[PDB]
Amino acid sequence: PAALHDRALHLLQTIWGYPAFRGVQGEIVQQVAEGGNALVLMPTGGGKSLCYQLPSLLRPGTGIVVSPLIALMKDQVDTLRQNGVRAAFLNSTLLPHEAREVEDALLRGDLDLLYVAPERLLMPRTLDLLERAPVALFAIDEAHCVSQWGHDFRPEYQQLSVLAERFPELPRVALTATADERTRADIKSVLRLEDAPQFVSSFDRPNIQYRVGLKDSPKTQLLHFIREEHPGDAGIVYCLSRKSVEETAKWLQAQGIDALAYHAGLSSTERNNVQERFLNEEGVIVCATVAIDKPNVRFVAHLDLPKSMEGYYQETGRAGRDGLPSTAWMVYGLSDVVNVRRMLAQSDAPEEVKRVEASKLDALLTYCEAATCRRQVLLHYFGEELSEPCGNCDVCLNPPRVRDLTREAQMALSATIRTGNRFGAAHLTDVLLGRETDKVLAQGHHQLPTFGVGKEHDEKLWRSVLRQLVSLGYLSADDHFGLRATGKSRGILKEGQKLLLREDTLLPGLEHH
Ligand SMILES: Nc1ncnc2c1ncn2[C@@H]1O[C@H](COP(=O)(O)OP(=O)(O)O)[C@@H](O)[C@H]1O
Ligand SMILES: [Zn+2]
Known about the structure:
Blueprint: H1 2-15, H2 25-33, E1 38-41, H3 49-58, E2 62-66, H4 70-82, E3 87-90, H5 96-107, E4 113-116, H6 118-122, H7 126-131, E5 135-140, H8 162-166, E6 172-176, H9 184-190, E7 198-200, E8 208-214, H10 218-229, E9 235-238, H11 242-254, E10 259-262, H12 268-280, E11 285-288, E12 299-302, H13 309-316, E13 326-332, H14 334-345, H15 351-368, H16 374-382, H17 394-397, E14 402-404, H18 406-418, H19 425-433, H20 459-471, E15 475-477, E16 483-485, H21 489-493, E17 500-502, H22 503-506
Parallel strand pairs: 1-6, 1-7, 2-4, 2-5, 3-4, 5-6, 8-13, 9-11, 9-12, 10-11, 12-13
Antiparallel strand pairs: 14-17, 15-16
Helix pairs in contact: 2-3, 14-15, 15-20, 18-19, 18-20, 19-20
Protein name: DNA helicase RecQ
Domain Helicase ATP-binding: 29-197
Domain Helicase C-terminal: 218-364
């Protein structure tokens, strides 16, 4: 009721000292407290931990928490108990007499929370014992580890699928900081969360302004940006190679801005040197690769595209941990993107991994190539949905020049619907062009009314119109990289909504060498 909500608040105040719920917490709490399942996505420091702790206390019985991290579980228990919350940890390095003092406290219903290493949890009899205990809920922390594409991975987290089969009646909560569009499908498979609500909260950072542009002579381009907009300011400037980092630094010092290289082949010495000369003093600039601390950074500059949307989110987020406005500045070139693809084409990685890695690359480029608000594109990749344009990005503020492909979009959307939402971008494009592949013949797709219906255009165009549909969320990729129309597809199909491309991409043509 509202009498549940009131109840939770009096807990929020009296225990964690927090005044009010951040982002979607209060929904999650009331969702789980009432018996519901949940997927929770929040960035690090976002406030996950009490998403499960608060329901544990509101429901009769004990919240059961699983995380791979033992040392942090020990600390999270301690702090909980000093704050007046009855918590315990159980793992197999406890003396057997301790493991029983805790096991019996569970069964008597004496614990608000019990933190359990997956090692112990997965053991039947830890399983069986739980069925005899007054359990309020399960919380699978670091929930992403269930996924091979998951940031981290463990055999043991795949096995937590047991929780849903052995305890279907009881609420299950998964929380992870880092999830792409599907590592998430795996979380949802494994833990049987596919019908549960999904919550994302803290990903946005409203005080950072995002800008992307192409590269012609980037050093001057950067130098000019610092210059006008951040002369006495601290900033990070990111490059792929160790080589670029040191040129960029030598060069920036040659123009007498105070700049320093930072990277793994700096002797220890110099690393700590650069570190506090950057932290202590204001208006100093670090040139880093992928590598730490700083409160007030004004600008992050990317002289290269990162290898993922994740990396880019991380590095730009180093700006502005003051609520005070900051800018993220990036310049890329298609030249580069082509190199990344061939360097990943010639690799020795498995074909399953190349498809996924090229996936991340497309998402990254398409993010660059946005004809619509950049903050929506960025946030969508992590599952956050921003209703309206931010007014804080380079697309919002200085709208680029766009071409209207809304009718082409409809052809693409309808092609994939009518083909049963399972087929991939290369394949679909074969359809709208009219190409009869020996793989197009296998599905009889050539006999459909949507075949060659897009013949007016070429491959490069459909592939990009495809990329955009995915990126804006009009398309979703199921497997194995095959594409679904979404609930959002209707916007383009009822219309009222358009699919734009940057006039920037298209250009008078043809390319030449
Ligand atoms: N509802 C809230 N309102 C204000 N501050 C919060 C709120 N929830 C969490 N925080 C803060 O930010 C931190 C979140 O980190 P924690 O919840 O401890 O683990 P995680 O990094 O997984 O979220 C908290 O410890 C607390 O300092
Ligand atoms: Zn915007």
